[PDB]
Chain A
Amino acid sequence: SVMACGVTGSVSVALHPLVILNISDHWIRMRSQEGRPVQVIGALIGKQEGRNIEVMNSFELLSHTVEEKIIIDKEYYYTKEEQFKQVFKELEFLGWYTTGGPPDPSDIHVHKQVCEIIESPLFLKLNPMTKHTDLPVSVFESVIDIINGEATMLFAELTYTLATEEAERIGVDHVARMTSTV
């Protein structure tokens, strides 16, 4: 269980449910194409107001595997950024997402690559094969610590709330319900 497991950080992440559906759809579509569950990876965009981070949208990222390690295509990201900046001018790259269980060495390797793009990226993990009764979404920050003389990166989990957008609430409710004025 190699991660931080100590003091809290920013602790102000507001997540929009659009992002959860984006990631679900990404995983469902890749699973449909390959006929088996596939780990999917992408970018998280939104706003940062001081220590409050608002995760508003997301998009799929391109990657390759060199031997056994996952490499994010950085040229693809910068191209995608030039494209999302035209329609979401007020939004910024906040971090990345992937699917699976608790964080692992591969997630740290990729997180370091994302750290080459932005200073303090968030990491969101979604478990589409959950056995439990709580929403299988977790958010993490990275901390850089020294253990036995080795300066290493670890994840620290952050608590998060769901967004309070009225139109989004009605949309989500309408989707969840799927069927007089009063």
Chain B
Amino acid sequence: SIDEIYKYDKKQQQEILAAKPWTKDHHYFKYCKISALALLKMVMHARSGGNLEVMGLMLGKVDGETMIIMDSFALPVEGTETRVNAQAAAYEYMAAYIENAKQVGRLENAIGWYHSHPGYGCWLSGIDVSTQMLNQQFQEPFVAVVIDPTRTISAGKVNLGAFRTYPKGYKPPDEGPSEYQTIPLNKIEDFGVHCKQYYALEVSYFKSSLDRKLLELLWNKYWVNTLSSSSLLTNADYTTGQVFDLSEKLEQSEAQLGRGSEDKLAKATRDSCKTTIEAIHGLMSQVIKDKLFNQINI
């Protein structure tokens, strides 16, 4: 049953919140299921912030080791990424929003917070870790979602991560693959300092039976938009910003070879590869358009 997940069982949620199985295991929550609606709304909000960080709250529920995000909404706050618990400034607004949402049949409560990292990847900074640690101390069960709208566009793939922090003093176990992301030099220090203080959840998405139907019928006309994307100039300034960074990274990797951190050149090579590969994919779409609409004649 595709729509079974949309059923809200209040007593079952109260029972889970009274049981608190997450207190028995700091790796209890392993999966993050996000509705297509919440994904779209968070990505749309994230893009609307442009190069500035925005944030919001996520409404949802828990089911075993899985955290479920049903909806989201933006918070009118300043200092996302600079202020610890910046969300706190919107407390009043959050209370009213939810109250008004309950009046129209939104039954799910706060399950987490989302914020954007435009052009610098999905991870938790020091400020983010303090914020999420506060949230897990006083508002548990809570999850932190991070989205990079800029990299979503440049890579043609959704750039989203879901994270949970470890309590102060607690050490993670042996296994940590850590899927690699290019982090700019102005953020890499803080990234490295806090990268072992949290873990990443396995993210998956879902939609309803009606969403399924409507998206197939939308596609019957929305295909036109895929052959008219123009991705190379929409967010050009990003690739030029990344090249700048890449240049300074290469300066540091040259300084490493000078006389005498673990092989900076290989990292820089993977960064230059990623940026170039994205650029060539852009050109691939442009050439495809040229082959389909220009090389036809009378």
Contact = CB atoms under 8 A, between A and B. Distances in A.
Does A touch B (CB under 8 Å) in the complex?
A: yes
A87 B75 CA distance: 7
A128 B281 contact: no
At the interface, is chain A mostly helix, strand, loop or mixed? helix
Contacts of B218: 17, 20, 135, 162, 172, 176
Contacts of A169: 222, 225-226, 229
Contacts of A80: 100
A136 interface: yes
B40 interface: yes
Contacts of A164: 225, 228
Given A169-B229, A174-B157, A128 B210 contact: yes
Contacts of B281: 181-182
A2 interface: no
B205 interface: yes
Interface string B27-70: 00000000111011101101100000000100000000000000
Most buried by B among A27, A28, A133, A134: A28
A138 interface: no
Nearest to B103: A62
Contacts of B130: none
A21 B149 contact: no
Interface in A124-182: 128, 133-136, 162, 164-176, 178, 181-182
Contact of A29 (B6, B97, B157): B6
A181 B284 CA distance: 12
Contacts of B103: 62, 76
A181 B220 contact: no
A166 B70 CA distance: 23
Given A32-B3, A166-B153, A135 B220 contact: yes
Contacts of A135: 214, 217-218, 220-221
A88 B215 contact: no
Most buried by A among B106, B157, B208, B209: B208
Nearest to A79: B100
B8 interface: yes
B159 to A, nearest CB: 10
A20 B43 CA distance: 16
B96 A83 contact: yes
Nearest to A167: B47
A90 to B, nearest CB: 9
B91 interface: no
Contacts of A174: 39, 157-158, 205
Interface string A1-36: 000000000000000111011101101111011000
Given A80-B100, A168-B43, A30 B74 contact: no
A53 B104 CA distance: 26
A48 B76 CA distance: 23
Nearest to B41: A18
Interface in B221-267: 221-222, 225-226, 228-229, 231, 234-235
A167 B149 contact: yes
A23 B16 CA distance: 30
A97 to B, nearest CB: 13
A170 B214 contact: no
A65 interface: no
Contacts of B152: 167, 170-171
Nearest to A42: B104
Contact of B222 (A25, A134, A162): A162
Contacts of B56: 87
B192 interface: no
Given A27-B210, A60-B105, A166-B234, A175 B205 contact: yes
Interface of A: 16-18, 20-22, 24-25, 27-30, 32-33, 57, 60-62, 76, 79-80, 83, 86-88, 128, 133-136, 162, 164-176, 178, 181-182
Given A166-B229, A174-B158, 5 more contacts: A29-B105, A32-B7, A60-B106, A166-B234, A170-B43
11 contacts: A18-B41, A20-B214, A21-B40, A21-B211, A32-B7, A87-B73, A87-B74, A134-B220, A168-B44, A170-B156, A175-B205
What are the 4 closest A-B residue pairs judged by CB atoms, nearest first? A60-B104, A86-B76, A87-B74, A167-B47
